[PDB]
Every structure is written in C-alpha cells, then in structure tokens.
Amino acid sequence: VDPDQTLKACKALLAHIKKAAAAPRPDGKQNLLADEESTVAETPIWLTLTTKKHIHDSHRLQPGKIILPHPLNTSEEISVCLITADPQRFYKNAVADEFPEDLRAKIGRVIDISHLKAKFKAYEAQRKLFSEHDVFLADTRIINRLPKALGKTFYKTTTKRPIPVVLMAQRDPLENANARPIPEIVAEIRKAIGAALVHLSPSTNTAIKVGYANWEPEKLAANIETVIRELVERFVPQKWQNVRNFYVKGPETAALPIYQ
Amino acid sequence: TTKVEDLARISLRPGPLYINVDEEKKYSTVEGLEQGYVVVEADKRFLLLFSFLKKMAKKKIIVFFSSCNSVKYYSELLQYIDLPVLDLHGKQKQQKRTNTFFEFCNAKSGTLICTDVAARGLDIPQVDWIVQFDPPDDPRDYIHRVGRTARGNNGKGRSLLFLQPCELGFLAHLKAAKVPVVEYDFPKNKILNVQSQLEKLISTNYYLNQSAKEGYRSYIHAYASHSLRSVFDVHKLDLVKVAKSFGFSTPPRVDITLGRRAYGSQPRQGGRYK
C-alpha cells in the first residue's frame, strides 16, 4: 500500500464527477430539486475490496463499525432512527431532556421493537420507513430480531442496514429499563452514525462507503488509508494472504485500482 | 377601451373630472423573457412546494397564491411543519404588512407568501425565484410584468409556474405569443412525503381544519371565477385529489357552479309583474 498514488487517483476520480454532473442533459430539461452543487455533493464514492476467497461463508447481515478519524454522516440533512429493545417512552424522554442539540436534531424517530412489529409488519410500511430516514441504528438486544421485522426491504441492500449499538446496563418494562448512564449513551450514538461500515457476505467484492464527492481529497486520502488498514487486520481472514485488488469508484463511473 | 366610456355616460354625471396618473411607459417585454413551468399532479402540488422550499432554503423565495385564505392556512401549517416562512395576507395589520416586507427586502435568505393581487400593488425586490403555485389572476400580466420582475435587472432570477396535466393549453397560449419555455424534471424520490403528518394534523387540530376548509373552498371558488376558462376549468379538476394536497381524505362539499317556448303564448304587454 502506498499513500501518494492513492491520493492522485482520489484527485482524478473526484474531479471527473464534477465534469460529469455539470455537463447538461440533452433532452432540454432541468431539475428543480437538484442543484449543481447538491449533485456534486451527495454522490458517495466507495472502496470496493476484491478478494480471492469468499469471505465469511454465510450472510452476516450485521454491519461492523470501523471508527473513522473524520465522520461520514454528519451533514445537516440526516434523519436517523433508533430501534430500541425496551419501553419507547424512556428513550423518548431521554432524547428530549438530553442528547445535546445536534443529536436532538438528527433523532428522527425512536421506535420500540414491539411497536415495530405491530405497525411495520406490512411491506408498505417497511418501504415507507426505508425512504423516510437515512441511517438506522439498533440496540444489540434486538439485532437478531430485525431480519424478520424489517425484511428484504431492509436487508436485500447493504446501504441501510441497522447499525449495532450497545445500550445495556453493563424483565418488567415499566419497572426497569437496563440502560447505560445517559451521557454514555449519547456519546456512543455519535460513534455509530459516522462510522464506515463493513458487510460480510459470501462474496468476493465488498463495498465500503468512504465519503462523498464534495470533500477535499487529502481528507479522503486519510480516510481511505484508515479503511484499508482496519479492514485487513480485523475482518478479512488470511489477512494479507487472501488480499487482492482494491478499487475506488463512484456510483456512475469506472473503477480506479489499487493492488495489494 | 370603448366599453369604458359608455359605462361613464350611463353612470357618471355630465361633468366629470378627468385624472391620469397612469404609467404610460408600459415596458411589456416581448422577447427578453424565459418562463419556467413544472407539470405536477393535483395531489402532490404542496409536496413539491414543500420540497422546493426545504431544499432551496438559504435563498430568496416569493410564492404567489390565489386567495388570502389559502395564504393564511399555509402560514399556520408551515409553522407546525417547522419551516420558517414569512407571510402577507389581508387578515393582518397594515403596519404588520409593511414591517414584513421591509424585513424581506433587506434579508439575505427567506421566503414570502402573498397573493398575486398583493404583489401588483407592491414593489418586488431582487429575488432568486418567483413561483406561481396557484393559477395567476390574469395570465397576460403574469407573463409580461411578473416575468420581467423575476428576471430582476441584473441578478439571475428564474420564474416557474405550477401546471396540472389538464392545464397544458397554457403551453399552446404561450406558444401563440411566442415566449420561450423550459420545463423541470423533478424526480419522484426527492419528494418529502409528509402527507401522513399533514393528515394527522388536519384530522386532530381544529384550527387547522377550519383554515384548511376555507383555503380549499377559496381555491376552488377563485378557480371558478377565472377569466380564461379554456385552460382553468373547474370541471376538469378532480376534487378528491386537490383536497388531498390541502390535507383532506374526503373532499369537503363546495358548490362548483357558484328550445321550445310555451304553446299558445304571447309576449307580455301589461301588468305589474314583480
């Protein structure tokens, strides 16, 4: 792995997307809800690991969080949902009388697991929930339960799968809700939102979100380097024996390689 | 016009007093204009307005409605829906009217709701958009005067008009006067579906229900009394869908309308028939 040639590709791919987006579209039409900067932004580029062995020969269906030095989803329009494994009113009161001001803004809807299976069992409702928020969290006490509850509409794609969040102490609902101290909760929510996410599938290609196309490239280069070093040492088996090509590519362009 | 003085000879006394404070320098531009339009279904007109205003925040926005009652209802709804928007309607103080516009003319960003008859009496400042949500009162004055004021001297100001699918004869009338058009695409994903939140508010809040009912009726009633009935026809309006935009699941009742002579008969000649 070498950092400079990673940077000069990161210049080239990012500069391409401005040329692609700013180019007009030939049927004589414009877009009301798509500014030139808004589509230069909000277009994520992501790192596509290519392996030799099929990593984790099963469907893991639970994301792993790689702590990024500078966070991913900390924009101004992010709606986030916290699926909690205990009385909804305790967390509703927790996020109202606490959870600073930024976290109070991003908390869109906190929903109990029991209220989720009653109100969102149908496939209208789990499609309306998919399109309404942007990142979904989950308590670790209900991470296994969400495949049945939020089914294919939440788990066919890896863009929005519920992020595992630990919210326990170290049961009658109204009497007791085993949770962390409240400042330890809101601090941990901050980590989960802005973390690059790995998704283990019986596959050779793994797409990891690294950032959007409006950041400055050295910011991105420091971010991709931390994604590279964390993923090999922690997640893919046969750490550098099973490693193979590492491409970076945007949602509408070709793949820019790095090899290992 | 010719009919005007015949109204004067029948109404006025033989000696009138003639006053002309008219603006004879009518700068009705014929070519230096470009009109925008968005074809939007009747049941997602508001959702496109809300998605427009939310994403085109940090800019200058002026919206034209057709009735002061719909301005009043949209003002109270947007405060509940949490979008800070300025307003200009007739149920306000005259002093509050002026301090609202002076605040808007000096502001950097912002968004103002007023009726189209309010802007005709008002001095439009430099703005980034002029959006005609409801149909205009007189289409000739909209295209010429409001198109040029949207262009707004130097700064790039663009004007758009909301059109239903049953309203595309406006394009034929625009083509007759030979004025350029551009239509915007607006993908269906970026619509903020707050329809469920809206209908929960209308069905539960009583003050918003009154404002919704009066805004819906005034919108239909202004539509009926429109001058150019070829394109703005109320009988080509699906009233269930237009009450969906206002926040109703059942459209409230409104009166949309508001050969052989007698055998052996002769014309009347006498009698005090009252």
Side-chain angles (χ1 to χ4, degrees), chain A residues 25 27-39 42 76-77 128 131-132, chain B residues 38 48 51-52 54-56 58 129 158 160 182-187 190 193 196:
Chain A
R25 53 192 270 270
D27 86 310
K29 288 272 191 72
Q30 313 215 10
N31 238 8
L32 221 44
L33 307 181
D35 199 43
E36 201 43 69
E37 166 283 336
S38 80
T39 185
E42 292 297 317
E76 38 98 31
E77 307 269 342
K128 250 192 71 45
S131 184
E132 158 168 343
Chain B
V38 171
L48 202 163
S51 322
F52 191 41
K54 274 292 291 303
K55 169 161 202 313
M56 274 32 62
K58 278 83 70 177
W129 290 91
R158 314 141 51 81
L160 74 87
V182 166
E183 140 191 293
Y184 293 69
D185 183 52
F186 101 92
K190 303 298 190 289
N193 195 270
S196 317

